[PDB]
Amino acid sequence: MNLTELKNTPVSELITLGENMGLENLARMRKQDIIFAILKQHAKSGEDIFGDGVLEILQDGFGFLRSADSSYLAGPDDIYVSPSQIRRFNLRTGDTISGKIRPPKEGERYFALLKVNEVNFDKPENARNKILFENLTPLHANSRLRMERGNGSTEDLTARVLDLASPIGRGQRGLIVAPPKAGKTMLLQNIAQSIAYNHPDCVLMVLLIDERPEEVTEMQRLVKGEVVASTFDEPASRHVQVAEMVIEKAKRLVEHKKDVIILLDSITRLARAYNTVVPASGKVLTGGVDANALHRPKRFFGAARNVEEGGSLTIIATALIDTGSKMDEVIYEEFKGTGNMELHLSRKIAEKRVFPAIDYNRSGTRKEELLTTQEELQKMWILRKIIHPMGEIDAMEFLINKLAMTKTNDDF
Amino acid sequence: MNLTELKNTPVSELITLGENMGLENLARMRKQDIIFAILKQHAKSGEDIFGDGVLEILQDGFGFLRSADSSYLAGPDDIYVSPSQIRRFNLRTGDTISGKIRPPKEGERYFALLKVNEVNFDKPENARNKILFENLTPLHANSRLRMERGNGSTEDLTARVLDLASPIGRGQRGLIVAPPKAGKTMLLQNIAQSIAYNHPDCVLMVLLIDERPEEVTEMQRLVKGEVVASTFDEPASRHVQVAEMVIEKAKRLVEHKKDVIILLDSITRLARAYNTVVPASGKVLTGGVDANALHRPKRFFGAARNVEEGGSLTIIATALIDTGSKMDEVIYEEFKGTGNMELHLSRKIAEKRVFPAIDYNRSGTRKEELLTTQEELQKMWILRKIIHPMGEIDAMEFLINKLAMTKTNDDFFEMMK
Ligand SMILES: Nc1ncnc2c1ncn2[C@@H]1O[C@H](COP(=O)(O)OP(=O)(O)OP(=O)(O)O)[C@@H](O)[C@H]1O
Ligand SMILES: Nc1ncnc2c1ncn2[C@@H]1O[C@H](COP(=O)(O)OP(=O)(O)OP(=O)(O)O)[C@@H](O)[C@H]1O
């Protein structure tokens, strides 16, 4: 009886397994309520029930264990964490906890944790003690994330143009500037698919803020990583909670010297959600957004960095532009010189169905000298010197007609 | 007899046919009171009286049966539902209930439910836990709702342009951006007429929020579906109640693998009613509207989706723009990237009496690849590539002057490449 195993099984199968235990009011209930009832009926059997989840501490000091399957949504199937446990184990908001859970007594309304088996995929040890705020921050350039999954596929074409224009490194702040209808939704999943095949050691998390539900289901069923999202029919507090949970889990995993990658969608809408949630403090609003509010999402984007001790924390967020709203324009202007990697998309190139729509002249990475080989800098700069006088769309033709012949593996 | 039978009969017949039973002081009273009195006078005859209505459960735990004819308005002619009954039948706020009702007692003012005959057009067998919150959400491009009647009528012309510009699929989030005096009201009824004539299997519901009464009567007398409305002389709580009742009925009907379509008018007015009703707790507000309030209408628009299990839930809402109020501007800005289908109208094209006035260059549907045939995408792309360099006012001329010859099934036989 593993809680996570229940949460990953379809609701249609939950009815058959729950009805076979003597439960009748499961005819039309939510998956969380069904799982809670099934556990409470199986808890009467005195058998060991196992559970796990990502910790989130509330204001009162006890917190709960949110589920990654439910995108860290508050529900009856959550696990209560005692404050004394948080005093026994130095637990912060974001620690993945696994262990045996106990049945609820009279008047508790939530399950509680009996034993702490593992903390962040490791036994309860305090060896990995260096919190992310205390780790030194070198430049992103001490590794390259090559997105080259194959040799002769149409998918790798966009990834090959990405590798040629803006190399990706461990712990880089990626910023994808994209107008509407410019190939931004498939560009993210193309990167995510290439991440899992090329760098399986990296923990890949795709965060979708203020996204349509059908595209959420498309993404979470097509990417082999951890896809978390919050649909537009949810309050901005939900978006803020999901974003902070994801960033805290990433920080805690990086504290274990792991390489974590975050693909954030619509950072502008995340900043809008923050402006909505933050209790307005100063009346100095410009363009509709409170200034101090923008302090909160920046910190999110500020978490991405390379670590001198170990591991990395990579964040690639998409900045929406040409939306017609001055709010998104002000957000993008405030996020101008924050990232060390910028990937620009052109709407005019997407009109003529050239699907790699990267503005090569307006795309690049800072400190790319250490992200590439000594001889790799020369070829990329020579290629950029001849693309500079070219047109905005005529450059992509010149790229594809030469890139679709050979690979980036052994150039010439 | 049947309460519903009375609700659909004119008030003139309620007085003439009801006074013949011995009640003559119901003339100067409301239709709901007239129906209540007629039922109470016909109930003393010991004849089985049947009733039905859409369930609405209150906060206290009991519910009533609102009438679709009265646009789900609270009245004396409603049927009380006991909570204990709700414990036997795990009923939600959208379940349409039909069955035998009992007469009220002296001192009681509402009818009660004796027997539960049908639940959502079916025997009470709710063994499938197909609640909307648990159904999977595929994309809206499984089946296409084509608005091509083939009648070759000027009416079908606007619908033919609609099919050419933005195809409609099962379970789509439609957003009709429309300035004032640009052909919005006529565009909706054209869609509603084409839905009932082409796709009778779909349950069509036309929701009108903050609408004038004469236009409400115009709409409910021209659409072959279920027309529900709440006039502007009613509080915002009424608008919220009507909208939530409609969306819950749609959700419950989708739970039975049915294809439900919702034509919502003035989603901006629904968001305004929500902002009025929502208990402002967030001390922030932009443009006059509270931000947290906007969480409530979005969910309505968020309900529209395709379902992997069965049926669909289609919602096409009209977003008002260029009204001069920053409130509507903020609402439209918050609903910018929410829908997967956008149909824009231009007042300048409508000003020249070319009334379809569709902004072709800024209208379209995402993932339209699965809504059309393999060769239909090519023809649409070729047609859009030649409209792209044209203006707004000159594109509709080129479309209409060429569309009135063929029927959008032969329109792709000339200028082939
Ligand atoms: N690399 C590609 N290869 C093939 N087809 C693509 C590619 N990129 C985009 N497309 C097609 O073009 C469309 C581009 O839209 P996409 O989903 O990429 O994001 P977008 O439309 O820019 O995002 P938004 O919804 O915010 O406008 C897609 O629907 C897809 O069918
Ligand atoms: N399809 C059409 N064909 C011909 N004339 C039309 C059409 N649609 C609208 N009109 C003209 O426009 C006027 C009615 O348009 P409609 O009622 O759709 O405006 P509206 O935008 O809904 O109004 P409001 O801006 O007040 O909501 C009438 O005078 C009618 O002559």
Numbering used by the authors:
A (entry chain E): 1 to 412
B (entry chain D): 1 to 417
Reproduce, without paraphrasing, sentences from the article in which this PDB structure was first reported.
Rho is a hexameric RNA helicase that functions in transcription termination in E. coli.
Crystals of Rho were unexpectedly obtained during studies of the bacterial ABC transporter NaAtm1 from N. aromaticivorans. Although Rho was present at only ∼1% of the target protein (a bacterial homolog of the eukaryotic ABC transporter of mitochondria from Novosphingobium aromaticivorans; NaAtm1), it preferentially crystallized in space group C2 as thin plates that diffracted to 3.30 Å resolution. The identification of Rho (molecular weight 47 kDa) was established by a mass-spectrometric analysis of the peptides prepared by trypsin digestion of the protein in the SDS–PAGE bands. The molecular-replacement results established that in these crystals Rho adopts a six-membered broken-staircase conformation. The relationship between adjacent subunits in the broken staircase of the present structure may be approximated by a screw operation with a rotation around the screw axis of 60.5° per subunit and a corresonding translation along the axis of −7.7 Å. As demonstrated in this report, Rho can crystallize even in the presence of a large excess of other proteins, and thus it should be added to the list of known contaminant proteins in crystallography.
